[PDB]
Design an enzyme around this catalytic site. Sequence first.
Site, short mmCIF file in Angstrom:
data_model
loop_
_atom_site.label_atom_id
_atom_site.label_comp_id
_atom_site.label_asym_id
_atom_site.label_seq_id
_atom_site.Cartn_x
_atom_site.Cartn_y
_atom_site.Cartn_z
N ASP A 34 25.01 -22.25 -17.34
CA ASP A 34 25.40 -21.62 -16.08
C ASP A 34 25.25 -22.54 -14.87
OD1 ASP A 34 26.12 -19.75 -14.11
OD2 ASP A 34 24.14 -18.82 -14.10
N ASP A 218 31.55 -22.54 -11.30
CA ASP A 218 30.59 -21.66 -11.97
C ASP A 218 30.98 -21.35 -13.42
OD1 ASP A 218 28.61 -19.85 -12.65
OD2 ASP A 218 29.22 -18.32 -11.21
C1 LIG Z 1 25.39 -13.91 -9.02
C2 LIG Z 1 25.82 -12.67 -9.78
N1 LIG Z 1 26.06 -11.47 -9.21
O1 LIG Z 1 26.44 -10.58 -10.23
C3 LIG Z 1 26.43 -11.21 -11.37
C4 LIG Z 1 26.78 -10.59 -12.70
C5 LIG Z 1 26.05 -12.53 -11.15
C6 LIG Z 1 25.93 -13.58 -12.25
C7 LIG Z 1 24.50 -14.11 -12.35
C8 LIG Z 1 24.34 -15.15 -13.47
C9 LIG Z 1 22.88 -15.62 -13.44
C10 LIG Z 1 24.66 -14.57 -14.84
C11 LIG Z 1 25.64 -15.15 -15.63
C12 LIG Z 1 25.98 -14.65 -16.89
C13 LIG Z 1 25.32 -13.53 -17.37
F1 LIG Z 1 25.64 -13.05 -18.58
C14 LIG Z 1 24.33 -12.92 -16.60
C15 LIG Z 1 24.00 -13.43 -15.34
F2 LIG Z 1 23.04 -12.80 -14.65
N2 LIG Z 1 25.14 -16.35 -13.19
C16 LIG Z 1 26.26 -16.39 -12.56
N3 LIG Z 1 26.93 -17.55 -12.50
S1 LIG Z 1 27.06 -14.94 -11.94
#
Ligand SMILES: Cc1noc(C)c1[C@@H]1C[C@@](C)(c2ccc(F)cc2F)N=C(N)S1
Length: 359
Positions: A34, A218
């Site tokens: 990530d 991202d």
């Molecule tokens: C910021 C945000 N706001 O709502 C959401 C959903 C996110 C993701 C957070 C994270 C940590 C994330 C990714 C995948 C997953 F499977 C669970 C996650 F928690 N990484 C990102 N890039 S976006």
Amino acid sequence: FVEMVDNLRGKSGQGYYVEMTVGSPPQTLNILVDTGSSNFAVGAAPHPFLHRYYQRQLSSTYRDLRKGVYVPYTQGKWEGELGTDLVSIPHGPNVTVRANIAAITESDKFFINGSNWEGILGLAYAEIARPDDSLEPFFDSLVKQTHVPNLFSLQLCGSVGGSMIIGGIDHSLYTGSLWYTPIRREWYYEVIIVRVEINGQDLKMDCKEYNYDKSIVDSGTTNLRLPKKVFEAAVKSIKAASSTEKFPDGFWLGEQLVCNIFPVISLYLMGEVTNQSFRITILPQQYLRPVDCYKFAISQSSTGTVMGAVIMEGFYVVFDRARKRIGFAVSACHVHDEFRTAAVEGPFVTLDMEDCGYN
Ligand SMILES: Cc1noc(C)c1[C@@H]1C[C@@](C)(c2ccc(F)cc2F)N=C(N)S1
């Protein structure tokens, strides 16, 4: 870097994960890659969704930091206990580092039911690390403790596979030349979009709108997320270009599924040189994702542009931290047809690119 080729696995819409080991003796875990976060956080309790979890009691090299961390997102949340332990990547560089690990003890809407990962590797910068920037991210620890170059690259291929090349670039994973865009600020992997084209037709918007309030790269997000004002103009142009077939309004908003007509989407990114840019072009094969049922994977955003898997799957992406730049090249694995392919083209003359960044 042949041992690092094809080291990513996953299922469609469930993200890309790499095998990692934590502790002594090593505990094998699958960890989501990530670039949109900065914490190394792993399941540490027997949540029903998890194949396995970090068992701190079995590790002789575990050190408790005696600090908790609560991390809420827009969609879901997790709470963890902070510590340090020895971490390695079996299909990465042959090194072992002491890194910060958030042992997840409580979560909601975080782990995916049916997924094969049990943790997340935040590859972004300390500025967005939780609880604060004093908690060193994994890659910062890796570069400091070893001779691994301050660079990594991602080839995400459209169940799913790919390569995370740690400390370098594998030239067999891309065609043509790499084109670099500056990392505007070291928090997220923030970039500046200077122009957007749909089938070669410019959207004719104030370029500041494309980066309101930011634009990021991202790997932990599926969709190409666009600011709502940009999304509405983008969708209207996509609707006009695909006027041969009529689709319900819910499909464009991602509220419903649909079972050559669709236009290409080009993003011009700020180049390395004053008044110089380059463009990256994606296909319908990237933004119309199978769920034959297809979901429109371009959505409105409140947090600015997110160049997610929709963009990244078309390209070999180099996160050149040492030179504060991100490289884009046509992926050797990207999905295309006989008529159109994904492209990285330049150089182009683009003036007032600094005005595109939001302050
Ligand atoms: C910021 C945000 N706001 O709502 C959401 C959903 C996110 C993701 C957070 C994270 C940590 C994330 C990714 C995948 C997953 F499977 C669970 C996650 F928690 N990484 C990102 N890039 S976006």
